[PDB]
Amino acid sequence: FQVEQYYFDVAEVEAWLGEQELLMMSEDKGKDEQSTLQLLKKHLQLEQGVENYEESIAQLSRQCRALLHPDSEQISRRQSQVDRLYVALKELGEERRVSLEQQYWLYQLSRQVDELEHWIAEKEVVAGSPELGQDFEHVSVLQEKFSEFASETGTAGRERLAAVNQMVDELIECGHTAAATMAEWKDGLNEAWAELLELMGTRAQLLAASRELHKFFSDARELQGQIEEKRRRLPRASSMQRTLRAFEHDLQLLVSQVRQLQEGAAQLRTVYAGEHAEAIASREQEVLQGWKELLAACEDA
Amino acid sequence: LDNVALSSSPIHSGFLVSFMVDARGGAMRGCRHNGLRIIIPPRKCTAPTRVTCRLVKATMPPMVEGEGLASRLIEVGPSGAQFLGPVIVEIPHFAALRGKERELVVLRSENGDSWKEHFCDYTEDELNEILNGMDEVLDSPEDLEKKRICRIITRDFPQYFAVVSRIKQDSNLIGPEGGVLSSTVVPQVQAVFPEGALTKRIRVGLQAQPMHSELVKKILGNKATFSPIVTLEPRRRKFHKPITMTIPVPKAPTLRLLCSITGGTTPAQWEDITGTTPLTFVNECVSFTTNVSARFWLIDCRQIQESVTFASQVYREIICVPYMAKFVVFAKSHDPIEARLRCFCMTDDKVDKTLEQQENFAEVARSRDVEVLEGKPIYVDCFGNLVPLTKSGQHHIFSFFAFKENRLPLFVKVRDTTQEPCGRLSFMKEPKRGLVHQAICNLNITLPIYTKE
């Protein structure tokens, strides 16, 4: 009778609820990021469908209310069962929504960590380079260009690091199951980045130390060259007087250059030893010898 | 003194993994791990170079039974670095040296696949000279053994270093002529090499590991009494003549002899050779001869038939390498009645885990360094104003390995709300029912106040 038709409606609703449950319990989380995205969309549509079904369950509520009294002992229990069962399906919806989100985040966070790790690696290789220059001008170029790299990477990497660390801080705050692993992941990046910042410091230091040595091995070649100019004095009159005055002024110039070069050379002895020290006081001996002969000739004048 | 900074005087600084040095000389301590320090002297470096000294956390150095690393592998560079004078590298370690029972050895690998012992040839005068003009101070040997700091002196650099805990070994070259090789730890332990037992000259070594009655008596009681374990390091080698071993008897037929001829990393297997080999008792010691270099051991067990099993019961335990580690306990309160509790046993591990700080966990207890034994399990129980959930089921435990993580998750509920929520946490080697035997460490605690989130 009337109860039979009502049972039919409850049966249809119960079947729909089970059909949704069974589709929502599926264990497939995804492969690539898009697969888990598409599944999160799908399950969102299922959740919206479940919410939309509220009116359909409402129709049962009205029918049961207008039926409840031939035998309502079974009727009340059966409908109340639908009430709690539907509530349970909704909670399970929140569960599987959450686990699909957390799966997606594990997928993306892993992509970013691996990408940043490879990114530090690329920078690290360019920071731990051993090239130091064949000539002073070239080492100067590397020093300036690397300094630019130090600043650009120095600030560039910070944004990426802050993004990954915050992404971890959040996913740990959420309560992600893999949070323990994530913590080490962050510790791995934070130390590695710090080392790069330290490495680029040492490398920059190395370049500076190289520049001064090249500077000495610039002047040694350059100043000794001006020594040959002294030979001009041996062959060489108002015009001659003017040239001689200019020449004497040039000698005054020279004195400052040689004094600055010798003082510069002193630092290398402090910073170098053995073969290198010996080669420094070596070239610092050759130039000084030129100083002695040139000064003696000038004294003769 | 009020003297202008020279700017040509050693550099005092700290580093993470690498730093810059010049012939000026430098002292580079490390912030990450206390006691890690590099001391390059002045004028002992040819040119400005980037030095590296990072703990690798390559191929593991071969280790026989009874040996384990004292510290994580040390990586230093440049790999081919050469210095005019010796330089100092100091690494902290965790191996429990047990007085003079154990010692440390240093290994080095140039390429990372082959390891060789590291020995340095220098003058007694050089040791004072090594500091040169530096103002640094060097800790005395006892003050180094106390801080568990190992000091490697090296005149060149290799790709890797390793500090390895082992049983004290006495080594001395011996050739055809003959020789004697006695023990420092146990003077009565001794080995004699007759005239013509070896062809070439080899550096023979001898270990003696004495017994501790607490462990032996605990595992066997009065069932048997042992002597030290005497080991001849060039194992699996037949001698062209017979060696004469001397070993003091086990303090109490009734006396059996056990020997293990295994070599390399193979776990040892004990057999009894009392019948085959004659035993001579002089001055409370036993002297026998042997044509092979093996392990040896004496037993005064009443049950001769089971004697070998008794050795296996003891050996299995006492080979485990002893590490001095810290116990740290973290906790968060689920509510006032209950709480969550994470426990760790650490050596080189992070002083303060980031995860616990992020999850708002709190350090509630922290033991001084204590001897735990590598590879053996740990039992945890709480005995004070709170207790840990358990039932008619298996307990919870964690295993200690060195330089791995050692975590034990726990849940604890306050037993009674009458008094403050303080407790007692004990880590043991065996579950607590009889007389309780010394635990591994004891930490008291006090559950932190509930956080509302």
UniProtKB/Swiss-Prot annotation, chain B:
Species, as recorded: Homo sapiens (Human)
Lineage of the species this protein comes from: Eukaryota, Metazoa, Chordata, Craniata, Vertebrata
Residue stretches making up the ZU5 domain: 15-166, 168-301
Gene name for this UniProt entry: ANK2
Record text about domains: The tandem configuration of the two ZU5 and the UPA domains forms a structural supramodule termed ZZU. ZU5-1 mediates interaction with beta-spectrin, and the ZU5-1/UPA interface is required for ankyrin's function other than binding to spectrin.
Tissues where this protein is expressed: Present in plasma membrane of neurons as well as glial cells throughout the brain. Expressed in fetal brain and in temporal cortex of adult brain. Also expressed in the inner segments of rod photoreceptors in retina.
Renumbered residue ranges of the record's region UPA domain: 286-420
Disease (UniProt): Long QT syndrome 4: A heart disorder characterized by a prolonged QT interval on the ECG and polymorphic ventricular arrhythmias. They cause syncope and sudden death in response to exercise or emotional stress, and can present with a sentinel event of sudden cardiac death in infancy. Long QT syndrome type 4 shows many atypical features compared to classical long QT syndromes, including pronounced sinus bradycardia, polyphasic T waves and atrial fibrillation.
Function noted in UniProt: Plays an essential role in the localization and membrane stabilization of ion transporters and ion channels in several cell types, including cardiomyocytes, as well as in striated muscle cells. In skeletal muscle, required for proper localization of DMD and DCTN4 and for the formation and/or stability of a special subset of microtubules associated with costameres and neuromuscular junctions.
Protein name: Ankyrin-2
Signal sequence extent: none
Modified residues (Phosphotyrosine): 379
Subunit and interaction comment: Interacts with RHBG and SPTBN1. Colocalizes with Na/K ATPase, Na/Ca exchanger and SPTBN1. Directly interacts with DMD; this interaction is necessary for DMD localization at the sarcolemma. Interacts with DCTN4; this interaction is required for DCTN4 retention at costameres. Identified in complexes that contain VIM, EZR, AHNAK, BFSP1, BFSP2, ANK2, PLEC, PRX and spectrin. Interacts (via death domain) with RABGAP1L (via Rab-GAP TBC domain).
Stretches for region Interaction with SPTBN1: 13-135
Post-translational modifications: Phosphorylated at multiple sites by different protein kinases and each phosphorylation event regulates the protein's structure and function.
Domain of life of the native organism: Eukaryota
